[PDB]
Structures are given as structure tokens and as C-alpha cells.
């Protein structure tokens, strides 16, 4: 469990390192990535190619919640969905602000969805053209379906950010996972501000006899 595995792909990043829990999809992933990477890699990307697949090192079988955004930040993507080491990205700041109001943690310097017990943050498409949101949907299409399908065999709740972004994706996903498709952190009329999806997640988990998420674990001090 503690040792990562590796497969070769034809183009950058040439090797994909991954946790055992992802084994069932890797052969397909390699096939699909070899099909599109040449086209994809002609653009500067967020994240860089060496970071495309680093989230495949995260275990899945101990996760109960996936928090999913459509693609990486248009700039400064780290390969960890939502992660902003300087805490400048609007999405993670708005998320932090909701969690602050939820948890009573008023003083903090950042927030990270990838250090919370039971939560896997996820970017549906694994790259975009640097500076251009959703620009690589055409390349990731089949890979993105493959990976999300795999994730939702493990998690109990899937929380998707952006109704236009995800209502179709969520609708067409055939899975027993419980879906919540909410407003995106930058929705007009400040709709995300009144959004209580993180609380809803915990209600659904507890209804299903599972432990709630401690969202305060995401804070950086």
C-alpha cells in the first residue's frame, strides 16, 4: 500500500506514478493518454505535464467524499486540485470563507482540500491551456469519464462545483454515489456565499451511517 507503482506512456510526462487503488483503470488510462497527448502537449499547460497525474498517488479506498471542480486553475496549477500555496485563487478563498463561517475558525492564512481526512479533491479535466479555462475538455474527455467513474465506486458523496459545468456530467454518470451539484465559487449574485454544501455533505454521510468530514482540517495557520 505504501509503495507507489509506475507505468510508461509515450509522451510527457513519460511515467505515471500511482497508488494501488488506481490499478484497475491504468491500462485504459495509458491507452487513452497515448492517443491524445501529442495534440495536448503543443499548448503550455496548467499544471505542467510532470504534475498532470500526481493526484493518482492519493488513496481512494479510505475516501468518502469527492469535491470536484471542472479543471485546474487557469494559471499556477500544482497538480493538486484547488491547491493555492500563496492563497490567492478565488475558488479556495471563497471555500475557506464558507468553512470559516461553518467551523468558527476566524483566523487562518490558507486552506487546502487535500489534507482533510476522508476527502479527495478532484479536477475533472487534468489540464487546461495556460490562461484558458476548460480549453482541454476535447483531449481529456474519455480519460475524465474513466477516472470519475472509478472514484465514485469508492466515495459515498460527490460534490461538484458549477451547475453549468457539471449538471450533464453528473446526470450521465451511472453510479450509486450521492450527487450534489452546487454553485461555483464565482457565480453572479454571490450565490456561492449562501451555499451550505459542505454542511449538506455531512448530513448525507451521517444519514448513511458514516463519519462526518471535519472541514476545519483544511486550514493552514
What residues make contact with a second copy under the rule CB under 8 A?
160, 166-167, 170-172, 174-181, 194, 196-197, 199-200, 203-204, 207-209
| Interacting residues toward Cl ion by CB under 5 A | 162-163, 183-184, 187
For 8, the grid coordinates are: 510508461
Q: Sign of torsion, CA 153 158 161 163? A: positive
* Least gap, CB of 106 to Cl ion (angstroms): 27
**Catalytic residue IDs:** 71
Q: Of Cl ion, a second copy, none, which one sits near residue 199, judging by CB under 5 to 8 A according to partner kind?
A: a second copy
Phi then psi dihedrals of residue 158, to 5 deg = -115, 120
Q: Which is nearer to Cl ion, 78 or 178 (CB)?
A: 178
Phi then psi dihedrals of residue 22, to 5 deg = -90, -5
* Least gap, CB of 27 to Cl ion (angstroms): 30
* Least gap, CB of 71 to Cl ion (angstroms): 15
Q: Which is nearer to a second copy, 147 or 181 (CB)?
A: 181
Each residue of 133-162: b (16+ CB within 10 Å) or e? bebbeebbeebbebbbebbbebbbbbbbbb
Amino acid at each position: 500500500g505504501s509503495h507507489m507503482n509506475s507505468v510508461t506512456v509515450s509522451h510527457a510526462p513519460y511515467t505515471i506514478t500511482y497508488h494501488n487503488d488506481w490499478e484497475p483503470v491504468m491500462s485504459q488510462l495509458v491507452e487513452f493518454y497515448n492517443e491524445v497527448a501529442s495534440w495536448l502537449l503543443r499548448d503550455e499547460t496548467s499544471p505542467i505535464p510532470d504534475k498532470f497525474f500526481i493526484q493518482l498517488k492519493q488513496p481512494l479506498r479510505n475516501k468518502r467524499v469527492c469535491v470536484c471542480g471542472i479543471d485546474p486553475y487557469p494559471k499556477d496549477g500544482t497538480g493538486v486540485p484547488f491547491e493555492s500555496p500563496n492563497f490567492t485563487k478565488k475558488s479556495i478563498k471563497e471555500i475557506a470563507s464558507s468553512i470559516s463561517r461553518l467551523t468558527g475558525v476566524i483566523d487562518y492564512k490558507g486552506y487546502n482540500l487535500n489534507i482533510i481526512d476522508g476527502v479527495i479533491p478532484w479536477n475533472y479535466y487534468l489540464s487546461c491551456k495556460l490562461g484558458e479555462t476548460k480549453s482541454h475538455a476535447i483531449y481529456w474527455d474519455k480519460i475524465s469519464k474513466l477516472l470519475l467513474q472509478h472514484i465514485t465506486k469508492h466515495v459515498s458523496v460527490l460534490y461538484c462545483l458549477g451547475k453549468t459545468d457539471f449538471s450533464n456530467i453528473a446526470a450521465k454518470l451511472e453510479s450509486p454515489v450521492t450527487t450534489i451539484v452546487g454553485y461555483h465559487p464565482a457565480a453572479r449574485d454571490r450565490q456561492f456565499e449562501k451555499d451550505r454544501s459542505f454542511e449538506i455533505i455531512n448530513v448525507l454521510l451521517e444519514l448513511d451511517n458514516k463519519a462526518p468530514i471535519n472541514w476545519a482540517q483544511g486550514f493552514i495557520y
